């Protein structure tokens, strides 16, 4: 440790003054800032991660909605499945396909989905 510069000094090269929404990257060697709007163009970028979990199920789509309602607040039914929060739930035979976002909250309620279909 202790291999940094001034703790209030950083190196930023994008998009400078004017208001900017940015990100800070600090390594064991260097502290640097990029502007978020500019950042998508760099080797570093905002990434949406879709993670799909296929869950064995013995009940019907109507029953899934019912079980989801038991735990959930916001359950919305859609033409091609169910959507809880930002989680896409679709029943496919005797398995449910769970696809959900990178986002912290989206995993948590999605976890609740998984237990609903599980047992």
């Amino acid at each position: 440790g202790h291999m940094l510069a001034k703790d209030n000094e950083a190196k930023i090269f994008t998009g400078v003054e004017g208001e900017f929404e940015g990100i800070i990257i600090g390594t064991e060697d260097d502290i640097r800032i990029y502007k978020r709007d500019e950042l998508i163009e760099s080797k570093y970028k905002e990434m949406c991660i879709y993670e799909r979990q296929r869950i064995p199920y013995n009940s019907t789509a109507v029953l899934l909605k019912q079980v989801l309602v038991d735990g959930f607040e916001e359950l919305v039914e859609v033409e091609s499945g169910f959507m809880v929060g930002n989680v896409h739930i679709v029943l496919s035979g005797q398995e449910v396909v769970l696809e959900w976002k990178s986002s912290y909250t989206d995993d948590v309620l999605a976890i609740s989905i998984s237990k609903m279909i599980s047992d």
Binding site: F13, V16, G26, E28, E51, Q53
Partner: protein, 116 residues
């Protein structure tokens, strides 16, 4: 100093309150700020967003570090004869139809990403 852009600036104390996470050896955080002079100041709270660097080669290597066999193809990585990792321009898709490996792959990708 503003030849390329700016370079060395002063970080405001507000950044110390930001949600820092560390990718690999780097530490990352998101913030909303106003830039005035040599001073960088936060005016808001960085939205909660995964940032990182997606390399198919690096992810594969790290997966193998978990003692998992990975196959390299155009579509991405096939781990343990079932995990699907697919790369999109602004994101990544992981397929859970693996037998008890999903958690491992989720760990690997998050080693190259961070919730900020």
């Amino acid at each position: 100093m503003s030849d390329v852009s700016m370079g060395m600036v002063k970080l405001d104390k507000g950044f110390d309150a930001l949600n820092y996470r560390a990718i690999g050896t780097d530490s990352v955080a998101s913030f909303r700020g106003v830039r005035d002079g040599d001073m960088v100041r936060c005016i808001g709270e960085g939205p909660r967003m995964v940032i990182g660097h997606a390399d198919i080669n690096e992810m594969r290597r790290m997966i193998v570090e978990g003692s998992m066999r990975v196959e390299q193809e155009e579509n991405g990585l096939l781990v343990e004869d079932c995990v699907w990792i697919r790369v999109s321009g602004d994101g990544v898709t992981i397929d859970g139809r693996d037998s008890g490996v999903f958690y491992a792959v989720r760990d690997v990708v998050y080693r190259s990403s961070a919730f900020i």
